[PDB]
Design a protein around this ligand. Structure first.
Ligand SMILES: CCCCCCCCCCCCCCCC(=O)OC[C@H](COP(=O)(O)OC[C@@H](O)CO)OC(=O)CCCCCCCCCCCCCCC
Ligand SMILES: CCCCCCCCCCCCCCCC(=O)OC[C@H](COP(=O)(O)OC[C@@H](O)CO)OC(=O)CCCCCCCCCCCCCCC
Ligand SMILES: O=C(O)c1ccc([N+](=O)[O-])cc1
Ligand SMILES: O=C(O)c1ccc([N+](=O)[O-])cc1
Ligand SMILES: O=C(O)c1ccc([N+](=O)[O-])cc1
Ligand SMILES: O=C(O)c1ccc([N+](=O)[O-])cc1
Ligand SMILES: O=C(O)c1ccc([N+](=O)[O-])cc1
Ligand SMILES: O=C(O)c1ccc([N+](=O)[O-])cc1
Ligand SMILES: O=C(O)c1ccc([N+](=O)[O-])cc1
Ligand SMILES: CCCCCCCC
Ligand SMILES: CCCCCCCC
Ligand SMILES: CCCCCCCC
Ligand SMILES: CCCCC
Ligand SMILES: CCCCC
Lengths: 113, 211, 219, 113, 219
């Protein structure tokens, strides 16, 4: 389907949280948030939830203790879009019985032609 | 540029004494510091993380403390196997620095060495060059003196000495003095001796052979 | 069982290159970070590089930036350090470490350390050692052993009866012997009454030259 | 209908919370969270809300007091998907009057043919 | 009323098998957990196994892992312990317990305990006992009773007049009598003036041999 039209929203979320991380942490953590690319990359590394993820997390939170509600929100706002989006498709996919009728009318009518 | 200045470089305390090691950071790193034990030539092992928390399996005599910008490793009762080099660490994905290190040496009572001498090997004489090995086992302190005597003529410039690291259980030293001589001067002479002049000996003890 | 077996070091000519492998076993490699930390003979520890096994992110020290390159293959379950433009400073023992966490990642512990492998950057060629027994003299006081002379580069791994005789061994560190080859001794003390009870073989090995030599010592 | 296409989402939720439990509790509670299968099984046992459920819960919370917000979230995020999904079907099922007309157009046309 | 009636134990040959049933009654079986805990004669309690009735999850002790198997049928409303490769160590009294909770599950209480059933692993065969009255002598001081000799295996359940005479009973524990059979006594003290007022029957029972014997005692 148009499931790549979905990833546009996820890149928008990456973008907005990367701009946030740039506005918040560029002066203090330049290698991780000094550019938009660095913020994108650091958010991806945190989203991996791996060793490097906690490694990035710890100094940012030592310097700015509130920073956690940044990261957590990025993990929540993202995951709850997908799920919600992913739960809407199922509803918009359970409207295809009418589509089976569509094909069947195609059969009968294109014989009449 | 997160600098870690560790002190002292060397220390020597008897068994049971209380050992302190300071490591100062240049800014508030509040608890990123770790402490490591490294026995010679072996892999470093983690003693302390979070600058206070003790790694699972470390004895209770190791403890980590903090004062603002100055971290401290304390050994309550120094054990002879605690002979090692200790390192303090920073922490970050993007940069990691260690301290200069602190070598902890053990102190114990005076120990006289077991002295031995070895003749050159049979197949070693086939090389045209021979070596005489004078062994000094299980002594303390590290300072000793090995003199060579070939036909009661003292040697110089043809011997080398190698000392082991301080042992884990008895904390004593071992020394190997290798005397290299061309086979010509080996066969031209008959009396060979090494004379140990150690602190734990009243009269310098000599070991000899005759070929 | 949770170990990091590293290999690939040894001798290399200046301006050359060398690959170091660190195979992880017993834990989850992807979730961990892998580290290369070097120690030159006679100094403290020096951080070289770090990498996330799963994420692939890398971080290098300013002293070796661009020249070294750290990588990690999760399928091969192993990290790697490629070293280029090697010089005299790079002559050191390199160690592989990990941070496997939720604990140690929020502190950069590093929790576990590999055993170490030597990298000597020099011009001269490899040479195998010569193993020469050291003859005894006569229920105690029997100092015997074997000498290992004229090898280059380091190291020589000496044992006794394949690890059977461990207590009493005083394998010495090597010396230079201006000629330019390493030469060490390996002594052990036993009861003199048992000169004939047990077999006394020193199992010398020198992997740079494949010199796997077994020699018995007897009066 | 495609009501098994729904259970894919529930298995995704099981998967993500099992990976969470693995990342959080594997080192400390290996029999319950040491593998992905163990985490799946333990989450199912907790979702049962039975004797074994509280039995699993108590040591995990004694060791990690925050762990409750793990379990609770797993119980919430799950149940509020189902309900929400279950409340969307009803809206997408109240659409079928047009379907009844569809069949009636099928009747009148097939004779026409 | 909230009870756990267990059965299925007794005698079994070494290397054999035996099934233990624990029927729950009076509470919600599914919501609870069921437990088998054993006590060998002359030691403390030993946990054997636990199971969630509803969830079906099981947990076994390392000492009996693989050999035993715990299960629970909610329709039959009963838990089960299947025992295989039985040995001399397994000779013990096994107890069935529960944790029915929201409060005992967050503590693993266990709140209620079944009454217990014996499992003796031996080679010899079942034998019924012999019930021999013990004759009195003459408003007090009348010690009478009956002896129960030559039975195997344990136990013998002695009563008096179907539980009518309870006070004064001193049913003894059994002994071995090197031959290899168990032999106990069962005494009771009454007023001597009532030797003729009440009937004194000791209702001996030995379920391994179905020996349901009633015997009166009189001077
Ligand atoms: C503002 C938010 C909090 C900021 C986070 C602070 C960073 C933590 C710095 C710790 C200093 C280090 C000293 C060791 C600290 C230490 O001993 O920690 C104990 C331990 C931390 O792990 P370690 O590796 O230090 O401990 C090893 C041991 O666990 C076993 O060897 O586990 C914790 O409890 C983690 C949870 C931190 C607790 C904070 C979580 C928030 C709890 C909230 C509860 C719910 C509130 C609900 C409202 C009713
Ligand atoms: C939740 C942390 C659990 C940590 C357990 C282990 C660490 C500490 C050791 C505890 C052992 C305690 C033994 C004494 C404790 C003891 O035995 O029970 C004392 C008390 C009474 O217990 P129950 O009502 O469970 O008693 C049942 C009896 O009626 C049956 O006879 O317990 C309660 O407070 C129960 C209510 C749950 C309390 C927590 C509910 C949430 C309350 C928070 C309200 C939040 C509002 C917002 C505020 C931010
Ligand atoms: O270099 C940047 O990308 C950058 C952008 C915005 C801000 N700021 O909003 O403070 C700082 C740095
Ligand atoms: O062990 C795994 O297969 C595995 C599962 C999840 C992730 N992860 O989403 O980070 C990585 C590895
Ligand atoms: O080789 C890898 O494992 C690898 C993984 C991720 C990325 N990347 O997201 O850029 C690159 C390499
Ligand atoms: O490993 C790094 O430091 C790194 C940083 C940024 C990017 N990047 O913006 O693609 C890649 C690697
Ligand atoms: O596992 C449950 O959610 C559950 C469902 C139904 C009942 N019940 O109705 O007995 C108990 C537990
Ligand atoms: O306090 C914590 O460390 C914490 C851990 C996990 C979660 N959580 O899985 O939502 C929340 C807080
Ligand atoms: O009781 C257990 O230990 C158990 C664990 C896992 C599974 N299982 O994932 O199938 C079954 C039983
Ligand atoms: C992404 C939101 C960050 C909020 C920062 C709050 C600082 C006190
Ligand atoms: C202590 C680490 C907890 C972080 C887990 C992810 C939080 C959403
Ligand atoms: C690609 C690996 C999927 C998870 C396999 C789990 C095997 C126990
Ligand atoms: C990456 C988020 C960490 C929350 C403590
Ligand atoms: C323990 C809190 C649960 C809120 C639904």
């Amino acid at each position: 389907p148009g499931i790549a039209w979905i990833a546009l929203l996820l890149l928008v979320i990456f973008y907005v949280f990367a701009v946030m991380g740039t506005k918040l942490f560029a002066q203090s953590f330049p290698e991780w948030f000094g550019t938009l690319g660095a913020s994108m990359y650091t958010l991806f590394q945190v989203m991996t939830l791996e060793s490097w993820s906690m490694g990035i997390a710890r100094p940012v939170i030592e310097a700015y203790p509130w920073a956690w509600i940044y990261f957590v929100s990025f993990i929540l706002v993202s995951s709850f879009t997908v799920l919600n989006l992913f739960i809407g498709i199922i509803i918009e996919s359970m409207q295809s019985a009418h589509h089976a009728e569509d094909g069947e009318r195609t059969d009968a009518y294109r014989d009449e032609v | 540029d997160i600098q870690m200045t560790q002190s002292p470089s060397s220390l020597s305390a008897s068994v049971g004494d209380r050992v302190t090691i300071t490591c100062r950071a240049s800014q508030s790193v509040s608890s990123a510091v770790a402490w490591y034990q490294q026995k010679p030539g072996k892999a470093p092992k983690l003693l302390i993380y979070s600058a206070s928390s003790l790694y699972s399996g470390v004895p209770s005599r190791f403890s980590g403390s903090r004062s603002g910008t100055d971290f401290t490793l304390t050994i309550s009762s120094l054990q002879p196997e605690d002979f090692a080099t200790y390192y303090c660490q920073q922490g970050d994905p993007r940069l990691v620095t260690f301290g200069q290190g602190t070598k902890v040496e053990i102190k114990r009572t005076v120990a006289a060495p077991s002295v031995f001498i070895f003749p050159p090997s049979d197949s070693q004489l086939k090389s045209g060059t021979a070596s005489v090995v004078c062994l000094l086992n299980n002594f303390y302190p590290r300072e000793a003196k090995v003199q060579w005597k070939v036909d009661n003529a003292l040697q110089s410039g043809n011997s080398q000495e190698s000392v082991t690291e301080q042992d884990s259980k008895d904390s004593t030293y071992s020394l190997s003095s290798t005397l290299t001589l061309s086979k010509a001067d080996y066969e031209k002479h008959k009396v060979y001796a090494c004379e140990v002049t150690h602190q734990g000996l009243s009269s310098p003890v000599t070991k000899s052979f005759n070929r | 069982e949770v170990q990091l077996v590293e290999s690939g070091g040894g001798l290399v000519q200046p301006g050359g290159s060398l690959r170091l492998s660190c195979a992880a076993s017993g834990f989850n490699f992807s979730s961990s970070s892998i580290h290369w930390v070097r120690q030159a003979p006679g100094k403290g520890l020096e951080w070289v590089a770090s990498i996330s096994s799963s994420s692939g992110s890398t971080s290098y020290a300013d002293s070796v930036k661009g020249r070294f390159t750290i990588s990690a293959d999760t399928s091969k379950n192993t990290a790697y350090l490629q070293m280029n433009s090697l010089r005299a400073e790079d002559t050191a023992v390199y160690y592989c470490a990990r941070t496997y966490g939720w604990y140690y990642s929020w502190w950069w512990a590093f929790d576990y350390w590999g055993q170490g492998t030597l990298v000597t950057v020099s011009s001269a060629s490899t040479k195998g050692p010569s193993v020469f027994p050291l003859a005894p003299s006569s229920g105690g006081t029997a100092a015997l052993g074997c000498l290992v002379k004229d090898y280059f580069p380091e190291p020589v791994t000496v044992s006794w009866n394949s690890g059977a005789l461990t207590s009493g061994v005083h394998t010495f560190p090597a010396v230079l012997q201006s000629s330019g080859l390493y030469s060490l001794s390996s002594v052990v003390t036993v009861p003199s009454s048992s000169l004939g009870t047990q077999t006394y073989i020193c199992n010398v090995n020198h992997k740079p030259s494949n010199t796997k030599v077994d020699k018995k010592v007897e009066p």
